[PDB]
Amino acid sequence: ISNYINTIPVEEQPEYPGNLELERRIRSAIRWNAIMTVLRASKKDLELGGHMASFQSSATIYDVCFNHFFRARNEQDGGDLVYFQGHISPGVYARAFLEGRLTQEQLDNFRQEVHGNGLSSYPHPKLMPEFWQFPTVSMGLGPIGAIYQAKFLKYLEHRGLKDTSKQTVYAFLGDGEMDEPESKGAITIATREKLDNLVFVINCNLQRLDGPVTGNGKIINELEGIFEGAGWNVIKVMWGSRWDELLRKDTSGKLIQLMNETVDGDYQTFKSKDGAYVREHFFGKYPETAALVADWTDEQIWALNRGGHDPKKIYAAFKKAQETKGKATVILAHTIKGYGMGDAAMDGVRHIRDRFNVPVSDADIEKLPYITFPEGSEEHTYLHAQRQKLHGYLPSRQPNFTEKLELPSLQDFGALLEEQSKEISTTIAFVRALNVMLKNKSIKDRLVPIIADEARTFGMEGLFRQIGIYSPEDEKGQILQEGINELGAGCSWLAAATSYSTNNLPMIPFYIYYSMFGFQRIGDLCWAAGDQQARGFLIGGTSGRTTLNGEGLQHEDGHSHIQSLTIPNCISYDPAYAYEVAVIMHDGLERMYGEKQENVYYYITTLNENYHMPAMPEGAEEGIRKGIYKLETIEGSKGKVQLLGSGSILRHVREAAEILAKDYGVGSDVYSVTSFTELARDGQDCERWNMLHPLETPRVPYIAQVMNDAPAVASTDYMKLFAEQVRTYVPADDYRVLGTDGFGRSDSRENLRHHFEVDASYVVVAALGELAKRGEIDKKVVADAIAKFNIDADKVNPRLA
Amino acid sequence: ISNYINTIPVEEQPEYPGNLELERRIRSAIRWNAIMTVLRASKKDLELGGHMASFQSSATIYDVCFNHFFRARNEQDGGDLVYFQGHISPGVYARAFLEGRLTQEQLDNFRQEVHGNGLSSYPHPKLMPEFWQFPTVSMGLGPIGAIYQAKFLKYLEHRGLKDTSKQTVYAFLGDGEMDEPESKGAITIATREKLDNLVFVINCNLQRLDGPVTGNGKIINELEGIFEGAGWNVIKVMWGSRWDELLRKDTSGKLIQLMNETVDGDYQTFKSKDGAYVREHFFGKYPETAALVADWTDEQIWALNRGGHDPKKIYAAFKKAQETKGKATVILAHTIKGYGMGDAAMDGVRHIRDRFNVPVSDADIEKLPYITFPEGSEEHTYLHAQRQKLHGYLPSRQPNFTEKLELPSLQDFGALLEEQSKEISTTIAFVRALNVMLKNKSIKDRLVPIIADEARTFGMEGLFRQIGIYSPEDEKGQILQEGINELGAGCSWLAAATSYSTNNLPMIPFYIYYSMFGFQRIGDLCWAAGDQQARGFLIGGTSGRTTLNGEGLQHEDGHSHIQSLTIPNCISYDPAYAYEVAVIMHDGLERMYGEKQENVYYYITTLNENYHMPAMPEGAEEGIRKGIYKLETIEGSKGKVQLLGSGSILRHVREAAEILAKDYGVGSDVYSVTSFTELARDGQDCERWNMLHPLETPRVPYIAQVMNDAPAVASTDYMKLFAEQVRTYVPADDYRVLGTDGFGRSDSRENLRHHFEVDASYVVVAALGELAKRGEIDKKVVADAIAKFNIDADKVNPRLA
Numbered sequence A, B: 001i002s003n004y005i006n007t008i009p010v011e012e013q014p015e016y017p018g019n020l021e022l023e024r025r026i027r028s029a030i031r032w033n034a035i036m037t038v039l040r041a042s043k044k045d046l047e048l049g050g051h052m053a054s055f056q057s058s059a060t061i062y063d064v065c066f067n068h069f070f071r072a073r074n075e076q077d078g079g080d081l082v083y084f085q086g087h088i089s090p091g092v093y094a095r096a097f098l099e100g101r102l103t104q105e106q107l108d109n110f111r112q113e114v115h116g117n118g119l120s121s122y123p124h125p126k127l128m129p130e131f132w133q134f135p136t137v138s139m140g141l142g143p144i145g146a147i148y149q150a151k152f153l154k155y156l157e158h159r160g161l162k163d164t165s166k167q168t169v170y171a172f173l174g175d176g177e178m179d180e181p182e183s184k185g186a187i188t189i190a191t192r193e194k195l196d197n198l199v200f201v202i203n204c205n206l207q208r209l210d211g212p213v214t215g216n217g218k219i220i221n222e223l224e225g226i227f228e229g230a231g232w233n234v235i236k237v238m239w240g241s242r243w244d245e246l247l248r249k250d251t252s253g254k255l256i257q258l259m260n261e262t263v264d265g266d267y268q269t270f271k272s273k274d275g276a277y278v279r280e281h282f283f284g285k286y287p288e289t290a291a292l293v294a295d296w297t298d299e300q301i302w303a304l305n306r307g308g309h310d311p312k313k314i315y316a317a318f319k320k321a322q323e324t325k326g327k328a329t330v331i332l333a334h335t336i337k338g339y340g341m342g343d344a345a346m347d348g349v350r351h352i353r354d355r356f357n358v359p360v361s362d363a364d365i366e367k368l369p370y371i372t373f374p375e376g377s378e379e380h381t382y383l384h385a386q387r388q389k390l391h392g393y394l395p396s397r398q399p400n401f402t403e404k405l406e407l408p409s410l411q412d413f414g415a416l417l418e419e420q421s422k423e424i425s426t427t428i429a430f431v432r433a434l435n436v437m438l439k440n441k442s443i444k445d446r447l448v449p450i451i452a453d454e455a456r457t458f459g460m461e462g463l464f465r466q467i468g469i470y471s472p473e474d475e476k477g478q479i480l481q482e483g484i485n486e487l488g489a490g491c492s493w494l495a496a497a498t499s500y501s502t503n504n505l506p507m508i509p510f511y512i513y514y515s516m517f518g519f520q521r522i523g524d525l526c527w528a529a530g531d532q533q534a535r536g537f538l539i540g541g542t543s544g545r546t547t548l549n550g551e552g553l554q555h556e557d558g559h560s561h562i563q564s565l566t567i568p569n570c571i572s573y574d575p576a577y578a579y580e581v582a583v584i585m586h587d588g589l590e591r592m593y594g595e596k597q598e599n600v601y602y603y604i605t606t607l608n609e610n611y612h613m614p615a616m617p618e619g620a621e622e623g624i625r626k627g628i629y630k631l632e633t634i635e636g637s638k639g640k641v642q643l644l645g646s647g648s649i650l651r652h653v654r655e656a657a658e659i660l661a662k663d664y665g666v667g668s669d670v671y672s673v674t675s676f677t678e679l680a681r682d683g684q685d686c687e688r689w690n691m692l693h694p695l696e697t698p699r700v701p702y703i704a705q706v707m708n709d710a711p712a713v714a715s716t717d718y719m720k721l722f723a724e725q726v727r728t729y730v731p732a733d734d735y736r737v738l739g740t741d742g743f744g745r746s747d748s749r750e751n752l753r754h755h756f757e758v759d760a761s762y763v764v765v766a767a768l769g770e771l772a773k774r775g776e777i778d779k780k781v782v783a784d785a786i787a788k789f790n791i792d793a794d795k796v797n798p799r800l801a
């Protein structure tokens, strides 16, 4: 930690290149318009919300960047990737409006988007696909997402895919937000990878929402200490130009001492006082300091500003940042929250009008008018001249990539569609499908396999010799190894999954990890990924409650699919066979990176258990993609049931079908459900359409088109709700669902499958139970089966176990 | 960062207090038993799993701690809180067995616990309620958890609730694990809070699973750099005692330079070599360094040890940490991962027994026998004598607290059961309920309100003046303000929620935050909380997709209940009325902290929307707890339906009921469902039991004892699945569910409820559609309703919007 003063002394401060007066004129108009759209929205009294205080404290920081640093998307690259602080959006809208990119009607529709011509509260690409790029409102996600975006840009350059050398990634953060563990939890990575293309801009106004970050301390010093410790280049923008003279005359070094010794809370109090309270309480601390302002008017004292409000001090920091190589830079900008709002945190509106000399007359002020700059005006000319010199306007977004890829056909996955000689798993099938893709000329180098330390666990070691590990094992290595960092890996996956839009360069990521450490551990990023229109593959390996058998409670995943189904644009599958994995992966590739360019990402749970992999039934392709298909029918004269299974449990329901036929003469229709979720969604869509079209013939859910009315039983390696979600659409009178509800524990797969009551014997008992209720068989028949199969009818519900 | 040598010079370390020779015999027997345990498990060929290499590298560190530092639970406090590294559990089980706390059968049942007398793979209190205490296998969670546990202990002392001054929180971490953002993301608060009762002990063997953490770097230096920068006291345990002579006589300072410049990758290669290699490649780098070992034999050079394996160096570090005040201490212990195994890292184990001189011939080595110390033996006596001096054995856990609390009665919440004067929200109801508890002499001071910055948003700012904010706003403040740090707030919540077991001092936490940032953002911690048997309240404020209307996509929560239902021991509720909030909170209090001491925690979603709060219907209490009750029946001669709602949407379902009655002559039964999830679980439990007892009287789902068979419609502020989960148990032919599937966006509550097709008009159309389907009404009526209510039947599915 250094002295509590600017990192760059005036003598080392470059000359400011812009017209300060004209820029203030433009900046004031932007400030006014941002305040007007929020105030107009609030006038509606519809609890719309929207912030002003924050943007007021950081407007000049952004202004300097828009005028002299921010490079817009161009023919060569996607420009600078700016992670705009979420709640300062009204300022971004205000500027875009001034630039003529947004209309007054859209501003008047701030936070009212349902009808089409509105603006989102925050940066939401899904909602404004041609405007916003990075979802930053969920604090903490922006800093880490930006770190890996910067790393990914280096990756593209190192892999020879794209020269991203002219791009800088800017993460605009708040000091309070740095408390989120993901904000500083990964900063050493930027040092390890020498991310000199990443700039953290922390708005240090010393306050969070309900108070100061650390009133009894100095967060700017805490921030400097840890970022410096993490190897980052730290630039503190503490004081404005007015202080330069005071510090130079400060021969006793007492001013610096006073500055150093004052804590955040104190500084914050002076904030609400006056030029005399300051001189008395701040400067008045030491005669050496009090004597410095002795010859100063209380107004000249109160005129001393924080560095984050001085274009000159701001420019110096961003310039130094862009010059620095070898490591990332963090700019700690000292600002005043709710700057120039005084009374705030029509008299107040008149105050800011006067305060920033806004060109609005007394006659119009009540109309809460938006200000614009006429073509031909100095402000209009300058505003656009600065942007054009920087490649245009930002933020802006391109929803689809331009190139045409020559994707592998399903037949290219032919070997995976055949019966397998060796017993393998769906994970081995996944890796195999990856290899098929690695042979496709068009996308082979666009593939981005991602691992979080463990590769051997997922049988990925074989890929290393083929494509290598990115290690700028060299800068040309293709696989991203992020170590024990699921969030960081997800952020690399996200950068890769959105490269098609950001850099107009489609990249296809495949991140495989322990399924339990997916949505459960990085769920907020997964939701943000949906917002960012990520197109990629998330592979939840070692999935299923009873399949990762020895690991126990914090590893056994019987619910990730319940978490994944909450994301609208995530397509989830739980295949049982290798050929299903092939079909599913081929379809995803086609949908996401083929002509369709569907904004959806995939989640496929794969297993670590080997078993016989049969050949794909001819014509099963569509059913596999839709989520279900009849595997086969077993004859039985004494009854008929329908059996459903997915993942590693399907082969157990298949065994139950043979037992049912063999021991009870009960035949059955056996279905492989590759996706209970896609089926549920299809069912919901049909029922929704039916309800909205009362005069039309009811549409039939696909699952109802595939199944019949015979009593049905479903068993899965996930909690019952996974299969129970399609009940409404199952055309059978009876539908019994078996599942792995309850906490996992360590055992053999056999003991776990019996414990969670999802094995063959339970499926059989469940099937017999429905047939008995129908009078097709006697109840003593099921009571005997229960005894026969060594089933404890009275053991505690596994959910409670 | 400092030189790559021990922090404590030999001339500064204290005399080792223990019997080194006796201690190594005991340590060797533990190492043996740990390996035997894992080897016998693998022999079973059941894919059970289990690690050995990690505990081998940290064995000596734990040994010194067990012999001279770890305080077991005692009459005065819970002893030292040790977050044992998850995968080194076999070593903990090995010592426990040697202490006579575990049986051979139990060791023989390592990772086979489904039938009882077995051992969990990792620290899981839910599975081993009297042994383990803190779930640490999900890496990254142990470190944040520990920081907040230490802070909570300080809190108990400062609040005058318990003298926790004699307790130390030890977090045993892996160096690879430090890559998880949660690992270092919150270390600055240990400095902010001067947590000198916290010790992070990182095993620095330089390797994660599949490779070194930073092959071309120095993680120990990286670690030292950021922790030192964060204000922590860093103690490096680099080299064993054999290095002291070499470092002492090296007047040139070249050995340190060599040590400093050598990277992690090279140090690791040396480990796979021999003395000759080291002499040439390491010492041979410089003449001065070559000269230090020139008079040494290759064997003597090969014997040079890493500090973390030297009891004297280890002891010095822990003793010094014990003396450090004002801040937390990190011990960076340098170790060898595949430490004795060497070649490994049933007879090849004779190499391990040889090197550690284990008493067992190669004749009984294939039998993999366990080693025990007979009562009276020098080893047995020393083992127990050391533990007795430290108050006993650990880990150990007490499942229930001993004291009896005088909980508030439901009557105490009587004001909340009456009709409210003004329109309030369920969040205002929650705060009012908290106030009732705050008047209870028994639990008022055991309450732990927790917020993450935002308090005003949740109307919590009023308790700020009565009970204060913890700020060691003073050291007696009751409210924990954790800033913008949901994970941290969650860890404080967990520490509080488990104080009943850890310190035999029940504390009742109430953590309120934006519901979207609950399970979605800290879901892995929530799962671990269940594992840790947390008893507390999670309050998801500003919940419901359409109710936090202006916030949009990353804030509008219509799925947290779908995430919360995946946790076995989390009880979820979505109340609509203030009296329901009261009944639920009181019941939760009684269940968790009353004589029942139920191991469950609560999740209640509350709202920021004000509306009329009616009085509780007489006798509705049990129904509120169970999940559903009939609000009222509206008469109608033209038809009859059932209408269900929860949270903010219930009042719109009631409006629909009036419309149907008044405009269409359709009568109805209106139900408020406080918990669709609890109703679903009850139904699942009933059918499970039923099918398991086929000849017995069938149990009827609670929801089927409330609803009848008229066509039903349900609507809530959550995705359809939240209400559809009870389908199987609804005693009706038609059960139409409306929901908020799809990403959120900004608009008025009205516009959002129409967009998400969940408002009164949609409920009416859904109900009429069901009747038309039964011919009880013309389809034209439904079509005209759709027209009247301005419903766009061809609007895109909200899930896809």
Ligand SMILES: Cc1ncc(C[n+]2csc(CCOP(=O)(O)OP(=O)(O)O)c2C)c(N)n1
Pocket: A054, A087, A137, A138, A139, A140, A173, A174, A175, A176, A177, A178, A203, A205, A207, A208, A209, A210, A337, B452, B453, B454, B484, B486, B514, B517
């Ligand atoms: C994960 C998450 N938690 C909470 C919030 C709610 N929130 C909005 S603004 C705010 C405080 C902002 O403080 P800071 O990050 O210091 O930025 P400032 O507005 O002062 O520039 C909070 C907590 C959020 N957006 N995301």
Ligand SMILES: Cc1ncc(C[n+]2csc(CCOP(=O)(O)OP(=O)(O)O)c2C)c(N)n1
Pocket: A452, A453, A454, A484, A486, A514, A517, B054, B087, B137, B138, B139, B140, B173, B174, B175, B176, B177, B178, B203, B205, B207, B208, B209, B337
């Ligand atoms: C969140 C999480 N991700 C992955 C794993 C799987 N895992 C088990 S051991 C291991 C590596 C451990 O390395 P380190 O933390 O350096 O400890 P060491 O075993 O070397 O002492 C990993 C990634 C886990 N337990 N938790």
Ligand SMILES: [Mg+2]
Pocket: A174, A175, A176, A203, A204, A205, A206, A207, A208
């Ligand atoms: Mg701030």
Ligand SMILES: [Mg+2]
Pocket: B174, B175, B176, B203, B204, B205, B206, B207, B208
């Ligand atoms: Mg390690």
